[PDB]
């Protein structure tokens, strides 16, 4: 159906922090304990109503390529926003955010929006990354911050809606126009379309 804007979002962060579960909670409203999938999530499409506008989101997941840090230029192509995730119970995953920010600086556009998410906030006894420390770091890297739980749903919908709003409100008029339904055709060919011998 119709939409006002179409945005491309990415999830990134260390293996095991809950990126795939966050996407599945937002897209399918489901959560599987001890999640393990033979076939990894590719991307999900969700249309949301945002402050009076219909926003279609194509949200990409890593397919496990972050395990040994093997994600390069292709994943970042055409991205409008990137959600960087860490696990509040894993200090190294928070330390890893610095490296992911360097990757984003290298491959994504300088105007890409970023959001920091500290996941697994339901594990209150095992938290090691303090909210204030993560908030200070997010402020220092120009990005909003939310702690989430794909397991119990805490802030999951709000994390994705926050990123959709960041993009919609920050884009220049020219960049926002490029995401409208009228400008969906970029002049590329459809390999599945019927021939024009």
């Amino acid at each position: 159906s119709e939409y006002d804007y179409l945005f491309k979002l990415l999830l990134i962060g260390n293996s095991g922090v809950g990126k795939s579960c966050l996407l599945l909670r937002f897209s399918d409203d489901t959560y599987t304990n001890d999640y393990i999938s033979t076939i990894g999530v590719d991307f999900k499409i969700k249309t949301v109503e945002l402050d009076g506008k219909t926003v279609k989101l194509q949200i990409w997941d890593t397919a496990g390529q972050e395990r040994f840090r093997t994600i390069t230029s292709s994943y970042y192509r055409g991205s409008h926003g990137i959600i960087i995730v860490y696990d509040v119970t894993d200090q190294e995953s928070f330390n890893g955010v610095k490296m992911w920010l360097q990757e984003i600086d290298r491959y994504a556009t300088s105007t890409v929006l970023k959001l920091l998410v500290g996941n697994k906030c339901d594990l209150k006894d095992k938290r090691v990354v303090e909210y204030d420390v993560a908030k200070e770091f997010a402020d220092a890297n120009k990005m909003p911050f939310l702690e989430t739980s794909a397991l119990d749903s805490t802030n999951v919908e709000d994390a994705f809606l926050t990123m959709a709003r960041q993009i919609k409100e920050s884009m220049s008029q020219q960049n926002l126009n490029e995401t409208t339904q009228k400008k969906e055709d970029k002049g590329n060919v459809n390999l599945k379309g019927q021939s024009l011998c």
Binding site: A63, F68, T72, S74, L196
Partner: protein, 442 residues
């Protein structure tokens, strides 16, 4: 905590290995794909401009100088090895079946031009252009038309459509004779449509030439303009897309990971696994490019010179085309091999606004390789920068059935990827024992 056992280990992330990795993972095989390099693509990677200077120049220029002349490094995705995609070729068939179209967008190439006595002419892409083209005279076009009508009405199962010809018994020269085509038309068909790099095909069974000519016609018919497609952001998007497909279906990837040692089964010469800084991994077979097993490969005897040129203007006499192929038939220069030029620009997101990339290549036949390319350099007008390299083509000494070491061929001098997908299908047959059968991904 890294699994030690796999069904298949793949070394090198060139496009041939990445397509095989994706297909084997889709088949349900547990694949480990390792590259000693810090990026995807192998020898046919697309690189940034700073990477291009590091690889081909003695004293790379500063970032300040590079950006004032060429803009942001991120706007550049320069192919090391030029290739277009036939619009109806096997790679498009694999892309649609695997949905790797989700990770790579494609735009048409504006046209293909053929060189004749110092000038270039656009090869027709529709009937109006065919009527206008001065490449053939009026009576020869009528004969050419009958020949193309036979290419399209020919049905293998219906002898009444063969017009007395047999694609396996008759040579292509005999096919040309039946239609009364002269030498200039044979050159046009052989070099501009079948894309043979010399005239050896004239004395060989017609079948392969017929298939190549039909592929060209079907490819032009898909979207018009030319028989080619080219990926947005460069050829490097292709191995990355197939690597993502493999990862989605269970594949494991390691980059910047040298192979400390290849392990073999005691006294048998058969592959057993690899030792790396992350541990030792085992599998009953390995798929790899020639750089991982140089002793198991041999030179084909051909060396290819590739000159990557940056222009600050469109190529002359191309109607300001945003992309094109130029074919220089070897008969026009007294050569043994054709010279090709592959041109793309900011319309395909491979360079900054205003620049064009023109990559010239040919098989070397003299002591002064740079001089062999002069006729092609002259077609480009002023050249801002040239990055030159020469590569030797290798092939496996054996097919891998005896040592379980299945090697790919070096990327060749052909202007498009059909020979690479032929290598993928052959390697797949050698590895699995049966031909590749594509399934439509859901």
């Amino acid at each position: 905590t890294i699994d030690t056992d796999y069904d298949v280990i793949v070394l090198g992330t060139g496009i041939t290995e990445c397509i095989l990795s994706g297909l084997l993972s889709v088949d349900g095989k547990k694949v480990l794909h390792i590259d000693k390099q810090d990026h995807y693509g192998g020898e046919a990677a697309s690189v940034t401009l700073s990477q291009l200077y590091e690889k081909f120049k003695q004293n790379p220029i500063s970032k300040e100088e590079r950006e004032s002349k060429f803009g942001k490094d991120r706007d550049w995705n320069v192919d090391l090895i030029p290739k277009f995609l036939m619009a109806n070729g096997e790679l498009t068939n694999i892309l649609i079946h695997t949905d790797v179209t989700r990770y790579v967008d494609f735009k048409q190439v504006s046209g293909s031009y053929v060189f004749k006595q110092g000038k270039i002419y656009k090869v027709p892409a529709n009937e109006i252009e065919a009527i206008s083209s001065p490449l053939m005279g009026i009576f020869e076009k009528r004969r050419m038309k009958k020949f193309l009508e036979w290419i399209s009405s020919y049905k293998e199962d219906d002898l009444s459509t063969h017009q007395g010809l047999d694609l396996d018994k008759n040579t292509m020269d005999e096919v040309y004779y039946k239609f009364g085509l002269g030498n200039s038309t044979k050159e046009f068909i052989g070099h501009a449509m079948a894309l043979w790099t010399n005239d050896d095909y004239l004395q060989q069974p017609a079948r392969p030439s017929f298939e190549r000519i039909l592929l060209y016609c079907q490819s032009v018919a898909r979207y018009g303009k030319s028989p080619y497609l080219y990926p947005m952001y460069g050829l490097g998007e292709l191995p990355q897309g197939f690597a993502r497909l493999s990862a989605i279906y269970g594949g494991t990837y390691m980059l910047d990971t040298p192979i400390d040692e290849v392990l073999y089964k005691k006294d048998t010469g058969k592959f057993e696994g690899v030792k790396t800084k992350l541990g030792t991994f085992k599998a009953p077979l390995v798929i790899a490019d020639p750089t991982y097993f140089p002793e198991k490969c041999k030179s084909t005897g051909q060396r290819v010179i590739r000159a990557i040129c940056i222009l600050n203007h469109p190529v002359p006499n191309t109607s300001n085309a945003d992309s094109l192929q130029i074919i220089i038939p070897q008969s026009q220069l007294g050569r043994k091999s054709d010279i090709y030029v592959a041109i793309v620009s900011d319309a395909h997101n491979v360079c900054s606004k205003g620049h064009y990339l023109a990559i010239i290549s040919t098989i070397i036949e003299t002591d002064k390789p740079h001089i062999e390319l002069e006729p092609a350099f002259k077609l480009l007008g002023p050249i801002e920068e040239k990055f030159m390299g020469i590569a030797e083509l290798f092939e496996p000494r054996e097919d891998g059935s005896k040592d379980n070491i299945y090697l790919s061929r070096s990327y060749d001098a052909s202007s498009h990827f059909e020979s690479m997908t032929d290598d993928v299908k052959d390697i797949y047959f050698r590895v699995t024992g049966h031909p590749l059968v594509l399934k439509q991904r859901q």
